[PDB]
Amino acid sequence: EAHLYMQVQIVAEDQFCGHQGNDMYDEEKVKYTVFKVLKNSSLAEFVQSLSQTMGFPQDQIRLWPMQARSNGTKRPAMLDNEADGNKTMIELSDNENPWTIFLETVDPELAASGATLPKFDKDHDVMLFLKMYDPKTRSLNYCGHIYTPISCKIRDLLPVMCDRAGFIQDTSLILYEEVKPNLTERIQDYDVSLDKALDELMDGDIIVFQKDDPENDNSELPTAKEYFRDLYHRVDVIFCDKTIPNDPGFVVTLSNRMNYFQVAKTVAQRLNTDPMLLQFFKSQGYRDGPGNPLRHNYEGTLRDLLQFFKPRQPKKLYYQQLKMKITDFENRRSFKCIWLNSQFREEEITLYPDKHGCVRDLLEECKKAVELGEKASGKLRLLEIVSYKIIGVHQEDELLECLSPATSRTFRIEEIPLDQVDIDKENEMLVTVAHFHKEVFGTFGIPFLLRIHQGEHFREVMKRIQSLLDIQEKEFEKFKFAIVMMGRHQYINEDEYEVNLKDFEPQPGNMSHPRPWLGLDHFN
Amino acid sequence: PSPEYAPIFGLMQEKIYISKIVVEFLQSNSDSTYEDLINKIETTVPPSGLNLNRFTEDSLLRHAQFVVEQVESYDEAGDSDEQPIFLTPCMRDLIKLAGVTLGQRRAQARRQRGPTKATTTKLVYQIFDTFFAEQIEKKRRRCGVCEVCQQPEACQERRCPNMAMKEADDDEEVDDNIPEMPSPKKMHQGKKKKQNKNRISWVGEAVKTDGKKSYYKKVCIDAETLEVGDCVSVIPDDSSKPLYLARVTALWEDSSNGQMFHAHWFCAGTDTVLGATSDPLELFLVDECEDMQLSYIHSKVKVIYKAPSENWAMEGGMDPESLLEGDDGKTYFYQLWYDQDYARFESPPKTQPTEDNKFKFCVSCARLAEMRQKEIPRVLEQLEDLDSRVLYYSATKNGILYRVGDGVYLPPEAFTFNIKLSSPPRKEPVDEDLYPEHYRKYSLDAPEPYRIGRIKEIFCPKKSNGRPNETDIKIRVNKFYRPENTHKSTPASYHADINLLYWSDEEAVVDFKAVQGRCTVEYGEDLPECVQVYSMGGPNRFYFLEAYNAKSKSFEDPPNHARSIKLPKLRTLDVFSGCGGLSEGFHQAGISDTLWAIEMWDPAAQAFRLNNPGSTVFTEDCNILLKLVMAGETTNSRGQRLPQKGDVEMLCGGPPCQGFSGMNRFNSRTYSKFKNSLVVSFLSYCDYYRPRFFLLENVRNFVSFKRSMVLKLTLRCLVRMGYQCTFGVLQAGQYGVAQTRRRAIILAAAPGEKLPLFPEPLHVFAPRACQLSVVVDDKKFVSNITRLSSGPFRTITVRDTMSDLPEVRNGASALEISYNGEPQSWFQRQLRGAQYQPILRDHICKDMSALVAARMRHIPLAPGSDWRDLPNIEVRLSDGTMARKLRYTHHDRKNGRSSSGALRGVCSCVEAGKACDPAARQFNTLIPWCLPHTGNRHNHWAGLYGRLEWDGFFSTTVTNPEPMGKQGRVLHPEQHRVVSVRECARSQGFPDTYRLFGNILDKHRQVGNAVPPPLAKAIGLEIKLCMLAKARESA
Ligand SMILES: [Zn+2]
Ligand SMILES: [Zn+2]
Incomplete structure (x- = not known):
């Protein structure tokens, strides 16, 4: 019969002291007393059971069912123990569970002296709750509750609030009603009765009061209204570093009504860095992870950044620390290219030079980014390759805006190999080499530049090829060596030793159009 | 050939090949635009024999003389009544660009499938054959300076190309956009004749004695009995007007004046927008009533309220001879209330007389009283x-x-406001060597x-x-x-x-x-x-x-x-949807589920399939589909289930107007082409399916086509068909779009429904592009829009449309890239969506030629800058050829010389009466040759090669961006690329998740043709209001 029970959670008035937020208490920051009770048990049985279990007389406690209101608040409500005493709790709660009840008792130090629970007239009495705001410490102090006739005038309650809050008597007080979060309404007329003074008067409403004192204009929150405003927009954001995997991040309390500059300043303070050396990423919203990067000029608030989180979900925000100022970082051009290492292996790299810089600046960035040879030259170069053929070398003075935006154009950066750094210009010649299976169109493999001497024993070139490649010493044999020019190719016998530059240079004074190149045939 | 003469021989062969390509392309179709011609030229593969890389706009602009001469020679031999092949808009644009003089040499060649028929139903064929009767009823001489005109003896060989071009320009231009043209005055305001009748007397007693001088009767005798509700013909004073027919709503004897009667005038169809196309025996109700004497009573007339049948939904397709019974057409009849201020056809008003006013009630009187009290x-x-x-x-x-x-x-x-609010250089004379065309620069704002x-x-x-x-x-x-x-x-x-x-x-x-x-x-x-x-x-x-x-x-x-209902969604048939802008707008309005769609173009149908998984698309011509539906089949060739009677509820579409794009008066050839076009087929669709709501969208010139004849005929077909029809002009930019594109909209509502009102403007727009008025038969017609150049929301600009897109350079083809930034404005925030981690799609731009790329790289970023700011600086191109400096070789009197004394002419044509000198033309120059060659005749070609303004807007829809086109500026405001496919889609207001298909050009065409969904949503909301009202009626 588990479906026949319900959890009844009792909260006492001692839990009201110290609460700094809206309404009576924080749902998370509170200790309940939970009761597992049969749905068909009567309420009277429950009032008896609680009074006996917690050690009170049944006529010394009052039950105030915790009832939710339309405005989104949750306040104590009225329950009649006598008239309604024979009805079951499951019908009284209207299908609610857990069921919270405020227990109003007499102060045991004022109850041991003989006082009892005052009577309450539903038509003419009201239960007012009193809070005191202290601007100097910026905090709330719970000042208990009071029974008061609806028709009573505020002026007759002023002495009570004063001596009930520990104020010297006849102290001028500023009164507000905390109607709901972000709604604190000042009471302008103290000479009118409570009915007229308080719109939609219900049991459980709370009037906050503070001293009327000039010192408040030195406080950054002179009144309780501004206090509840700043509290309404306060939110705890968890900042996480995108570089650190699964970084739990640190939590900073900020205001929703905050722009980019203030947030960046705060985070930079809690990180001991210059605000400009940080780039932020909004969360992808449903998944947890870095989303769209934020520009430095973003004209928004924190709510826009946290808007796709549920109020239950943790609101995370990613970031990364920069080595350079955020504006220059936003004006960097993503340049994807291929880096050739000491092992003759291709690596994918992405650099962010200034969009207006030159090739020189790119090479300088790569030098700051990479390591050089053991004792090689230490000078790098930039090749432009199309169809696995080098279609150009870019001089370090070329403009970055002058480079082929086409996807067929591949930019390689490579350390000049030792036997290619300084060669002999009128004897040795660098020839372009590429692979191909069967016909010459389907190229593949890693193309390369090969040195060639003068009148050189073509089988020297084949033992050089074998020395470079280094596969087993048979599979080299199926390479078919050809000379390709404008699509034509003539195959050359390896043991004939036919070599000289003239059959590799184009016609006299010719550069602009394709130079003869070496072609290799085998299958991949 | 010899190596020295090899370039010249190659140029001559290039001339031959470009002329041949142009002539076959013009054979293929006769409606292509200049951008289509450029694309066809560029896509052509150069021959193996000729050593040419690829034909570009420079090649066409340098061979224009020869290709235009060859094309003119083609049509100069065989002459027919069809439009000459060189009057095509693409080729007219090309002639206007390069200074080619027409009508010389030619004839150098040395002696060298069906009309079809739209599947119109019986009714629409009846209407069009009825109008076939009146289409037979039937300055700018030859130039005299060109060779053909100078040749001795219009003749088929003597058709002046200049005269034909001026006639075509008049055809395309609106003749004429005179704002006043005063608003029409009230009709029947003239005096009426007095008739000499023998004897007139009351019958019975005074029916109503009001106690004043008025004593109301019911039956009168003027040699014929008249009661309340009988209609009387009255002959007015002769002012070229036909006999008026008015319903006698009340008759009474006045103790002061003579014998009185109140007449509620009918209105003949000839007096409305229907014009001559209206049936002579058909009439309409109006808000025009007046009390006169019965002394001007001429005769008695009988009229019938031709109410729609109780089963009107299924009456489509039935032969009208079967339903012609009976005694029709013999007497006058009326079926639709007519409002001439807004050109609105409605069902007759259902206002009901009160018992006290039963024998005096005038529906015009009650409507006027309600209108007067409401406005106060x-x-x-x-x-x-x-x-x-x-x-x-x-x-x-x-x-x-x-x-x-x-x-x-x-x-x-x-x-x-109490804020200060609005709180209030010149460069040196530019180097005419470095900026030799700045002199051509020189020497309303949105509220x-x-x-x-x-x-x-x-x-x-x-x-x-x-x-x-x-x-x-x-x-x-x-x-x-x-x-x-x-x-x-x-x-x-x-x-x-x-x-x-x-x-x-x-x-x-x-x-x-x-x-x-x-x-x-x-x-x-x-x-x-x-x-x-x-x-x-x-x-x-x-x-x-x-x-x-x-x-x-x-x-x-x-x-x-x-501090301080949902109806079922109408099933929709969307004809000629394209990529589905209208359907997407209606879906955003939440009123329509498009369960069918027709589109002949394959990529558009593929896009519709991708965007609408729960819809069926028939990629066959609409005539075959309609014929199959009439014949009674249930599955097409591929087995897709065709909709049947009653399935279609809302029918929306826009048909192409290529066949009847002219604006001169109708001709037998043009009317024969119109009679079997696509708009008549779409009207036949509306006739057969009898949809509750009917929507026709088209370009603005649809209203004034053939002297408003297309609009008049469509309205006549709708009226005869029993609908409630209205038409208007909507400016797209007023409905959340950063683009000026006026559209003609025709709305129709089924009998028993409510005719939708046109949507009110939302975003304020510049008054120069908000001329929504219409001129028909020397009458000014306005839509029911009350907001005149004002609105709640601010204007939407390009900065709110394309600013946040990550920078890409020319020739980009990466379909899927990352956004790399949060949206920076409301429009892009709405277009992206709520979930935030997508991949930006179709952010690609055309890969222009190297010369064009250099030119549009050298255009400055100042607002409004165009080719006139191009510097004449020798610049290396990407491919390696040389862009030589443009040379001035003549002096032009009309503009004078530069401050430095340098020549400003480019050709001998600057001197009056001088033919253009061959071999004086230059090509492959940074500043184009044609622009200074022919600036003087085309307002210096202002706006050509220009950039978009960050505070401005698109000139029009961009179907295929080209710097030298008539679609306005197409260069990106900051980057050196043309507007991308995604940027064009953002201009139309498409959601970023909307999917396209095809290559880049097909995507551009799909984006250009489609209706902006924000415009469709605004219309869709208005239709939903009438959906509510009809449902709200049920009680
Ligand atoms: Zn009247
Ligand atoms: Zn000229």
């Missing part, structure tokens, strides 16, 4: 009284109730949107006697600051929501006549939901969060005293 601004409820003013709680105006607390629209001149306020009190000033003066009502209004009007000024509104408002404390006093509408202004925190839902919840909804202090120029919290 009156106050409703008194609240409190002062010595000088009296306070009220509510007021009414134009059928709208304003209480205290509702947001109110006010005209921009109603009041001014502010509606002011928005909040009522604090309604009061009336006490008169001298002390009684409140109800003639004038005063409003006290708390002003709301838009972010635009804040001290931050215009740059503040780049990222602010189009809806955001700032609460103020300054108060203004306005006259209640200045009120233009009610809008709901509300707080942000007191909202019971996210502000996005409230913004999208309903029209005219504004939200404010923080108040603005003018004196401190600061933002604070607003003071406390500032």
